[PDB]
């Protein structure tokens, strides 16, 4: 999904609000902040209502202006709440009644997702690969800066996981794929407009194809 969450490479932001080893305060800065993660784990591990991928996608589905003015932990609260409503566990009415006011949720999905690709390639360390020049309206774990770009394989994972573009939509056809650490030269991604050296992106097999 080409949403505002796909921030890598966006220009115009100011300084990162941190200097090295500065005091970051306690883990949680408010008494509610442990709730998003702990309730996500309730949903995933206890209820089996959704996957972590579904949580990432529902946050991506926040109305864009809403996403941009909401702190991280709050986005998560909104995401988990939305999933609970979508899965029929909770109602928005009861959330707003308990909250004592408006509790707007993420927007409905505009894609049913897609299955794990049937045709993929097992790549080896040192191989050159290109990121498939594909546009996916639903959940995908490919940041746009690498779409269509060429890099080298630095690592193939020894484990395999469900394809995010499927499990992020709660589909039954996510299968399993390894991922690959693909090293791109900075200039491959941003031309002359970068001060970096290389960027390594951890890409599912189904996002890749042989280079050339």
């Amino acid at each position: 999904m080409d949403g505002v969450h796909d921030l890598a490479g966006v220009q115009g932001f100011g300084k990162v609000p941190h200097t090295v080893n500065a005091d970051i305060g306690p883990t949680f800065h408010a008494e509610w902040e442990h709730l998003p993660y702990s309730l996500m784990f309730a949903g995933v591990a206890e209820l089996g209502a959704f996957s972590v991928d579904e949580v990432r996608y529902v946050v991506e589905r926040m109305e864009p202006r809403h996403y941009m003015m909401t702190p991280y932990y709050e986005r998560y609260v909104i995401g988990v709440a939305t999933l609970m409503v979508e899965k029929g566990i909770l109602t928005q009415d009861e959330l707003e009644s308990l909250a004592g006011g408006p509790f707007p949720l993420s927007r409905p999905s505009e894609s049913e997702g897609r299955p794990a690709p049937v045709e993929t390639t097992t790549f080896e360390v040192g191989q050159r690969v290109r990121v498939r020049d594909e546009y996916v309206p639903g959940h995908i774990r490919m940041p746009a800066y690498c779409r269509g770009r060429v890099g080298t394989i630095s690592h193939r994972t020894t484990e395999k996981w469900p394809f995010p573009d499927a499990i992020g939509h709660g589909r039954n056809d996510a299968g399993e794929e390894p991922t690959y650490h693909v090293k791109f030269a900075a200039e491959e991604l941003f031309g002359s407009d970068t001060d970096g050296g290389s960027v390594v992106v951890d890409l599912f097999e189904g996002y890749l194809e042989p280079a050339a």
Partner: protein, 197 residues
């Protein structure tokens, strides 16, 4: 008008979510309290620091950590949620590694601790992939021109830690002494371990 949606206070919304689920028997007794404790007390960059100090003083462990990070971490019992498949990345005299999750906040929780606000910031997520040298410089870390910067974007299930270079002036230090100078920011890759003057 680009205006914000009306919303109840976030604390009220977060507790509403808890109460709605808890009122239906869907949250086990002590469940969120247990997770809070884990997040605050167990998931900690002290663990990653311990791993680094061991790697620095034990060539055999260093090699294991760099080739099978998961196995190495498992020896300490530090695998966990968002830290089940670990890869450690080695800084060298010509290479500085930095970790980000440009798409959200993905972090090796059990060994780095939960991500801090700055790591989750749009500023860090947008900028570090494209101008890591400037970002680190602004944060207080100068990386020389003849060191390549490599940014790892945490886009799938690999969870990363940086193994920084061991600084001069630490020769013969104990593991405890070494652990002390390996900070959260060293593990993320934005800082270099500092030796007192």
């Amino acid at each position: 008008e680009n205006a914000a949606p009306a919303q109840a206070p976030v604390s009220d919304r977060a507790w509403a979510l808890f109460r709605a689920l808890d009122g239906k028997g869907l949250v086990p007794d002590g469940y969120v309290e247990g997770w809070k404790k884990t997040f605050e007390e167990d998931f900690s960059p002290r663990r990653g620091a311990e791993l680094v100090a061991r790697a620095w003083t034990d060539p055999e462990f260093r090699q294991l950590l760099l080739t099978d990070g998961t196995a190495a971490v498992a020896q300490y019992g530090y695998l966990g949620p968002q830290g089940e498949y670990i890869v450690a990345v080695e800084d060298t005299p010509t290479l500085k590694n930095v970790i980000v999750c440009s798409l959200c906040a993905c972090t090796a929780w059990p060994i780095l601790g939960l991500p801090p606000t700055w790591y989750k910031s749009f500023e860090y997520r947008a900028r570090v992939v494209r101008e890591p040298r400037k970002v680190l410089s602004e944060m207080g870390t100068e990386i020389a021109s003849d060191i390549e910067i490599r940014v790892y974007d945490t886009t799938a299930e690999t969870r990363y830690m940086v193994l920084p270079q061991r600084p001069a002036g630490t020769e013969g230090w104990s593991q405890e002494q070494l652990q002390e100078i390996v900070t959260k920011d060293c593990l993320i890759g934005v800082a270099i371990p500092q030796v007192p003057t």
